[PDB]
Amino acid sequence: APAGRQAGQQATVDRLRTQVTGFLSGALGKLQALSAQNMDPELAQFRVLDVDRAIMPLLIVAENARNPGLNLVPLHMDMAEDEEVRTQPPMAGSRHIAEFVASARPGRYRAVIDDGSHTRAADIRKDASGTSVIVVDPLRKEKDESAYVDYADNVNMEFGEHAKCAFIPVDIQKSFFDARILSLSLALKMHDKDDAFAAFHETLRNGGDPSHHVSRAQQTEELGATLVLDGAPLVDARMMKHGQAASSVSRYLGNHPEQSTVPVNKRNETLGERTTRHLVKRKVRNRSGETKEITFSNSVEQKRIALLNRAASYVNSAPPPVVMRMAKLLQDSLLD
Ligand SMILES: O=P(O)(O)O[C@H]1[C@@H](OP(=O)(O)O)[C@@H](OP(=O)(O)O)[C@@H](OP(=O)(O)O)[C@@H](OP(=O)(O)O)[C@H]1OP(=O)(O)O
């Protein structure tokens, strides 16, 4: 019985359910039309940044329910609280990292971390001894690879200096707007590789040799954070699935040939097979002239759509308190 679980608000719950599915379905429809027509969202004046920021807390709820133990939490860094620098306020329900680390129950967490303009994924472990975190950044655009040293130290600082930290920049993102969806995907993969990340957490906490987990690593020697400039095999083929540039995927396989024959999904595709299937040629904004035509993988825009599909299905049959919480999260996206 549904009425048993409705607590006398069947009318309110029903309307709020329709309201939430209505939004998810609306976004989904627009994003699907754009993808089906091989159209770049920015050039089409679709504001993905706003749509992603609004749907992201709802995706987190759906994914946490869909995978018990994922324990995905949205977090933000200090600079995300700066109204004058940040590109967007943090998503609804986002917690300040310092506040989270302080009060969080001990356990295993995933996170998407917002700095005000960019989002990364993270795997977090807090217990009596302290907190350890492994950050994977889907973006790797720095010319001089010394800037990553600073990134590693800054994250370690957010978690405090007695927290163990690993920072792994990966060349996945090429577009301006895909950080959120890529980070959510990376977070999910972390839960999928729970054991592998747990093992890395132990090495961090015990100060052992990182090369049991990753191929290239170094100490910042300012905070002691481990900067990982080559995550394989911790960063395996499955974590490279949504690589936007064909050359990023190719270069990765060229550098780690052993990754080229492992199946990345249940249909038994290799990374190269799957990536090739997602290749499209379309105009994108250049950042003279305004637009530039490129060939790249549309895997991320498909993933966004798949995530929405999941989320909507979940909402359609979700219990009333969950509907209530997601409706609220949707409303709260308009407060800052
Ligand atoms: O990380 P998840 O959200 O849980 O999704 C992944 C994955 O999607 P990714 O590309 O992001 O890795 C696969 O999908 P694709 O390779 O086709 O894109 C897969 O689907 P298939 O194995 O059937 O191909 C399946 O999602 P689903 O079972 O809902 O279709 C899967 O989940 P798991 O990795 O947890 O098993």
Side-chain angles (χ1 to χ4, degrees), residues 1-4 6-9 11-13 15-29 31-83 86-125 127-142 145 147-220 222-282 284 286-287 289 291-336:
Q6 295 274 12
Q9 297 82 28
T12 290
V13 172
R15 172 188 80 246
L16 287 194
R17 199 187 300 266
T18 294
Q19 173 183 303
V20 172
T21 60
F23 178 69
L24 295 178
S25 139
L28 185 49
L31 288 162
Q32 245 298 322
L34 289 175
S35 180
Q37 292 164 301
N38 190 26
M39 288 169 62
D40 172 78
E42 276 182 11
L43 295 184
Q45 295 290 83
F46 186 85
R47 292 180 182 94
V48 200
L49 289 185
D50 301 279
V51 174
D52 277 351
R53 177 184 175 272
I55 69 177
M56 200 64 168
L58 275 63
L59 303 184
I60 292 166
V61 168
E63 293 305 323
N64 278 333
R66 184 179 84 92
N67 320 100
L70 171 64
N71 302 330
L72 179 51
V73 177
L75 303 177
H76 62 267
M77 295 172 56
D78 291 339
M79 54 188 297
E81 296 207 347
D82 184 17
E83 330 193 353
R86 75 203 180 178
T87 311
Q88 268 177 321
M91 75 184 78
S94 183
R95 291 167 79 171
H96 186 287
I97 289 180
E99 180 268 354
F100 181 80
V101 173
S103 60
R105 261 186 169 82
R108 188 81 170 280
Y109 300 84
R110 278 76 204 190
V112 293
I113 301 174
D114 188 358
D115 67 12
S117 53
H118 185 54
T119 297
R120 311 171 165 98
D123 184 303
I124 301 172
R125 182 187 138 186
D127 56 24
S129 302
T131 297
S132 60
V133 55
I134 298 152
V135 176
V136 180
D137 189 335
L139 179 58
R140 193 173 170 148
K141 75 185 308 171
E142 294 287 346
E145 267 185 2
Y148 296 116
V149 169
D150 292 338
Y151 289 164
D153 285 332
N154 290 341
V155 171
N156 202 159
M157 262 302 95
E158 295 282 333
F159 282 89
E161 50 182 39
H162 297 306
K164 294 322 189 217
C165 172
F167 185 81
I168 317 185
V170 184
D171 185 27
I172 306 178
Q173 183 177 340
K174 289 305 180 191
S175 93
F176 176 80
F177 48 84
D178 287 321
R180 288 187 177 104
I181 300 304
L182 288 170
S183 292
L184 170 54
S185 171
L186 291 177
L188 296 177
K189 289 318 184 210
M190 285 163 176
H191 181 43
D192 196 49
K193 299 192 61 163
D194 192 274
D195 289 340
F197 278 90
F200 193 21
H201 274 296
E202 275 292 330
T203 295
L204 291 170
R205 285 161 174 265
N206 287 340
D209 196 340
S211 58
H212 288 283
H213 312 267
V214 297
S215 292
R216 182 154 70 105
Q218 74 194 56
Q219 221 83 297
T220 56
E222 188 87 350
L223 265 166
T226 56
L227 169 56
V228 181
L229 291 168
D230 197 337
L234 180 64
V235 178
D236 55 12
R238 275 176 120 269
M239 282 200 158
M240 291 296 306
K241 289 230 251 164
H242 302 303
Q244 302 197 287
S247 58
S248 297
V249 173
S250 166
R251 183 176 302 113
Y252 170 77
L253 291 177
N255 288 324
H256 299 96
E258 82 279 356
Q259 300 290 326
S260 63
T261 61
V262 304
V264 294
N265 53 30
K266 286 190 291 305
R267 84 170 56 178
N268 197 48
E269 291 181 291
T270 65
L271 180 57
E273 280 163 19
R274 187 188 182 283
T275 301
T276 292
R277 172 164 72 81
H278 287 81
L279 292 179
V280 299
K281 184 177 197 192
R282 78 174 62 149
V284 133
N286 201 345
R287 46 170 61 88
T291 80
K292 65 162 164 182
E293 200 186 54
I294 51 181
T295 296
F296 71 97
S297 169
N298 77 346
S299 186
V300 184
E301 88 188 14
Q302 302 275 27
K303 184 69 183 187
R304 179 183 291 102
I305 286 159
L307 287 159
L308 280 163
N309 271 327
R310 280 187 195 162
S313 278
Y314 174 66
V315 175
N316 283 320
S317 63
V322 173
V323 168
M324 294 289 118
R325 182 180 181 206
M326 293 185 78
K328 173 173 167 41
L329 285 175
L330 208 56
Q331 295 159 10
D332 282 354
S333 80
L334 301 189
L335 300 176
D336 297 319

